[PDB]
């Protein structure tokens, strides 16, 4: 009934269609256990959301680098920010570890004990750190505009859109990494080269991706 990643094969028994982006794609059966599938759903959403945020950063800084604004390219951006500002590297990395470890550990122990971060132990906050579903923490802070508690079918549509855009941005970031590792250029410079010569400037002419 529902479209499978590979038409003709039936989907596996542990992938039913209740999840967003459920195409029955598990050929290595990594999520047969429901707890492992729950944990992988939340890991997929976290990787996807970081990839969407990262890919938007790549694209906007590369637009601002091709148009003459003086923005670095993303493989030089961290070095030029640390060196042009008054920033020491390891202190900013440790402050990142502090803030991300706090938030991340709240996420970890809300996976473990599902309603437990809404006890009020963090400063006074109650039901604003309670989750709605697995990996969907919508209260007043994380869903301030409040789309998950009105028009539930439209919210299911947004869950589908979020999972699809996240998978697309994960393969796009793997893109940017591979594109840079092959060509040694900015990715929107690579896009400009492909728009210049489509038939002749590509991965079959980089001399790396197919070494024959």
């Amino acid at each position: 009934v529902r479209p499978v990643w590979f038409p003709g094969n039936p989907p596996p028994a542990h992938l039913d269609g209740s999840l967003a982006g459920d195409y029955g794609f598990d050929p290595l059966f990594l999520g047969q256990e429901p707890q492992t599938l729950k944990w992988y759903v939340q890991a997929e959403l976290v990787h996807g959301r970081f990839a969407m945020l990262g890919a938007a950063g790549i694209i906007l800084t590369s637009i601002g680098a091709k148009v003459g604004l003086g923005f670095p390219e993303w493989y030089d951006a961290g070095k030029v920010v640390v060196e042009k500002n008054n920033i020491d590297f390891p202190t900013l990395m440790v402050i990142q570890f502090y803030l991300m470890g706090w938030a991340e550990t709240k996420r970890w122990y809300d996976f473990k004990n599902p309603g437990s971060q809404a006890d009020g132990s963090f400063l006074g906050f109650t039901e604003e750190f309670k989750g709605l579903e697995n990996g969907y923490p919508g209260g007043r802070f994380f869903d301030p505009m409040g789309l998950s508690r009105g028009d539930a079918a439209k919210y299911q549509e947004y869950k589908q859109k979020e999972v699809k855009n996240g998978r697309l941005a994960m393969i796009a970031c793997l893109g940017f990494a591979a594109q840079y590792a092959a060509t040694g250029k900015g990715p929107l410079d690579n896009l400009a080269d492909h728009l210049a010569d489509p038939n002749h400037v590509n991965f079959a002419t980089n001399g790396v991706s197919i070494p024959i």
């Binding site: 009934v1 479209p3 038409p7 003709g8 094969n9 038939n199 002749h200 590509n202 079959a204």
Partner: protein, 202 residues
């Protein structure tokens, strides 16, 4: 069943204790797949030489078939719209889609007419049979509306196919040995049938 002339000296269509890819359903189906690809191969390896000898296509084209870019040691052709690897990746994606949906109809009969494929689902319902799907595109004109006419057309497809398979093995053999094209071999054997044979080119 099409082309059943009883010729099986090595007994490979035995239904008793079969399996794997040696099977009547796999062997007859791969027989018609090799037959159709070899008909296209025979026509495609003839056509530039005869159309350049007839004066219809120019002399920048009409090259020998092994100098097309199949074997760049044998010679390549600059004048395509891209490099042959740029061509070959499009071939990978396109033939992957085609051959892979064909494989899925072989493994699950009729399963290629449910999941959305741009409205192209009634075209790929197939039949209760591999190797002969039909439908509004694989049978454009309703040819073989009679069952006996359908058997006759399947048998003609089998015979023209086996002839083209022998012909394509011929094109490979002649191309390796005498180093020329098959229409050039026609010209030499029709010029001197005595002094231009396999026995001369050794």
């Amino acid at each position: 069943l099409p082309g059943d002339f009883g010729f099986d000296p090595l007994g490979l269509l035995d239904p008793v204790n079969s399996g794997g890819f040696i099977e009547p359903k796999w062997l007859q189906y791969s027989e018609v797949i090799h037959a159709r690809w070899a008909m296209l191969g025979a026509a495609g390896c003839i056509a530039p030489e005869v159309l350049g000898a007839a004066g219809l296509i120019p002399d920048a084209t009409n090259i020998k078939w092994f100098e097309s870019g199949v074997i760049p040691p044998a010679g390549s052709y600059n004048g395509y719209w891209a490099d042959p690897y740029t061509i070959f990746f499009v071939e990978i994606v396109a033939m992957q889609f085609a051959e892979l949906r064909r494989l899925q109809d072989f493994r699950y009969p009729g399963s290629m007419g449910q999941q959305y494929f741009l409205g192209l689902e009634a075209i790929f319902k197939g039949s209760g049979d591999a190797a002969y799907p039909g439908g509004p595109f694989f049978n454009l004109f309703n040819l073989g509306k009679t069952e006996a006419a359908m058997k006759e057309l399947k048998l003609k497809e089998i015979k023209n196919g086996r002839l083209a398979m022998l012909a394509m093995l011929g094109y490979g053999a002649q191309a390796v040995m005498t180093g020329k094209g098959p229409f050039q071999n026609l010209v030499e054997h029709l010029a001197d049938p005595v002094n231009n044979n396999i026995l001369t080119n050794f």
